[PDB]
Amino acid sequence: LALSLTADQMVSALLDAEPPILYSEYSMMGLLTNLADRELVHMINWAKRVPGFVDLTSHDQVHLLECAWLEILMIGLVWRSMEHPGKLLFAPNLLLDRNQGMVEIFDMLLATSSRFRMMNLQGEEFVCLKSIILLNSGVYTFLEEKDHIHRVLDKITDTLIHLMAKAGLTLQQQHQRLAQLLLILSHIRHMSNKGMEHLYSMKCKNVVPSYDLLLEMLDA
Amino acid sequence: SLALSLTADQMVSALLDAEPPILYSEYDPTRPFSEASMMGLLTNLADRELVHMINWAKRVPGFVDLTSHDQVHLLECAWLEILMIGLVWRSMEHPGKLLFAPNLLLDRNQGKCVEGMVEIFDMLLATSSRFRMMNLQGEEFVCLKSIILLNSGVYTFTLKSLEEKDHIHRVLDKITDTLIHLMAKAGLTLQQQHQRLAQLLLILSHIRHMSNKGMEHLYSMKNVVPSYDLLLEMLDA
Ligand SMILES: O=S(=O)([C@H]1C[C@H]2O[C@@H]1C(c1ccc(O)cc1)=C2c1ccc(O)cc1)N1CCc2ccccc21
Numbered sequence: 001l002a003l004s005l006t007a008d009q010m011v012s013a014l015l016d017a018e019p020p021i022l023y024s025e026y027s028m029m030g031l032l033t034n035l036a037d038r039e040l041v042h043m044i045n046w047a048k049r050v051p052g053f054v055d056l057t058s059h060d061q062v063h064l065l066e067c068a069w070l071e072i073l074m075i076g077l078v079w080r081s082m083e084h085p086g087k088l089l090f091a092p093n094l095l096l097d098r099n100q101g102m103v104e105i106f107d108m109l110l111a112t113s114s115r116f117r118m119m120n121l122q123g124e125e126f127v128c129l130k131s132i133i134l135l136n137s138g139v140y141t142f143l144e145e146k147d148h149i150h151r152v153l154d155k156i157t158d159t160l161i162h163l164m165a166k167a168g169l170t171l172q173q174q175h176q177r178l179a180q181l182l183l184i185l186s187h188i189r190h191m192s193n194k195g196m197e198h199l200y201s202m203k204c205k206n207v208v209p210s211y212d213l214l215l216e217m218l219d220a
Numbered sequence: 221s222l223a224l225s226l227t228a229d230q231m232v233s234a235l236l237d238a239e240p241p242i243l244y245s246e247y248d249p250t251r252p253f254s255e256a257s258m259m260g261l262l263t264n265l266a267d268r269e270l271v272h273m274i275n276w277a278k279r280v281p282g283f284v285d286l287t288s289h290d291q292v293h294l295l296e297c298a299w300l301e302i303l304m305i306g307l308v309w310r311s312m313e314h315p316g317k318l319l320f321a322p323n324l325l326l327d328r329n330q331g332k333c334v335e336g337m338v339e340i341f342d343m344l345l346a347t348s349s350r351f352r353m354m355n356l357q358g359e360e361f362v363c364l365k366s367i368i369l370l371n372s373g374v375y376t377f378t379l380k381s382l383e384e385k386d387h388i389h390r391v392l393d394k395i396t397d398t399l400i401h402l403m404a405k406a407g408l409t410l411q412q413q414h415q416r417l418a419q420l421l422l423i424l425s426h427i428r429h430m431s432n433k434g435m436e437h438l439y440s441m442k443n444v445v446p447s448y449d450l451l452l453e454m455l456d457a
Pocket residue numbers: 028029032033034035036037039070073074076077090101102103105106194195196198199207
């Protein structure tokens with residue numbers, strides 16, 4: 001079914017699954033932990049709505065989510081901050097600037113947002129990229145399951161190209177922009193690693209959702 | 221300043237010509253290895269490979285148009301990724317094993333000598349199996365290795381700085397064009413071309429992950445990771 005979707009249907013589905021922008025409830029790290037915790041609940045419901053994801057075993061769904069959760073949070077943050085040069089819009093009521101920064105990661109996030117601004121990243125491209133993160137980040141650490149995932153990934157590639165072609169990009173511009181978008185994903189992975197190790201360095205091991213947590217949330 | 225003037229065929233030929241040598245490990249290490257002695261062998265191999273990687277980097281079209289400082293920053297961010305993709309390429313035809321050198325072919329169970337390493341060995345072996353599944357070609361590999369050099373550090377760099385970064389993104393576009401040209405000449409449909417381009421670039425996120433995990437281990441242990449000063453000196457020599 002996922003493999004029968006057109007580009008317009010794929011975009012429509014991902015746009016409908018988009019979580020809302022949440023507000024901070026009001027310690028910088030208290031606030032961010034509580035925000036992420038609330039974001040995670042919406043992320044599970046979002047992931048179930050990504051075409052092809054629920055065709056996977058529950059075990060494989062958890063492994064993909066376990067590997068991608070912080071990259072997904074970060075790319076959302078970068079998207080929200082895109083119109084606020086030099087600032088990070090964690091929430092509409094939590095909009096931070098460097099001197100409030102951790103500052104090495106804070107600067108990497110700002111560089112990503114500047115890059116999205118520079119490329120005029122569009123909302124329909126953003127949701128395709130967040131779905132690529134979900135399906136790609138853990139596929140190389142798991143046979144028919146991994147084949148299905150690559151076929152779904154191929155569909156999201158097709159969707160990205162169709163979006164660009166209808167926006168009037170030439171064939172050359174289409175492939176160049178596809179590569180530019182996917183190459184930023186390597187920087188998002190790097191930032192998630194940096195974030196993970198800093199969650200560790202802070203005495204915050206415990207805040208990372210476990211395999212069993214994600215499994216139970218998926219079951220719920 | 222004519223790197224952006226190369227055709228696709230001239231880009232591939234430059235990259236193939238730039239390829240570094242295959243090096244050997246120690247001829248007769250005591251085996252079985254200990255944790256300390258295996259790490260010693262791997263570090264010694266990586267230290268010798270680094271010199272040849274700087275020579276290769278200097279021949280990647282566009283790399284020397286950058287300031288020395290920006291050259292080193294790219295090498296600092298990419299060196300382990302570059303060694304790793306070379307390892308995975310070497311190992312493609314050896315399922316279940318990692319061909320560190322012609323005289324150092326390690327299966328999986330040997331990565332267990334080192335705490336934390338079998339995990340990364342399993343990721344490396346998965347990448348080699350993915351390259352095999354995709355029938356990765358040598359012309360594609362050298363394009364990918366060059367993308368890693370230019371892309372991994374670009375997002376962490378005045379008007380000069382924006383022009384350096386713009387230059388990188390233009391060279392990266394040229395290598396994209398080259399990858400597509402290779403695929404179209406091979407006879408792939410346009411749809412297949414875009415799908416394969418994506419598939420190759422998505423593996424680069426996995427290589428970044430593996431390098432991140434390995435760098436963490438490196439920083440945790442001597443000062444094994446090459447310093448800025450060392451990279452600069454190798455570039456100036
Ligand atoms: O540790 S950071 O990397 C933090 C940023 C980011 O990764 C971390 C984190 C997080 C995840 C789960 C938690 O339970 C708590 C925090 C991310 C996030 C991204 C998007 C969101 O929508 C929510 C969260 N870092 C870098 C800059 C910075 C400034 C202040 C404090 C920490 C910090």
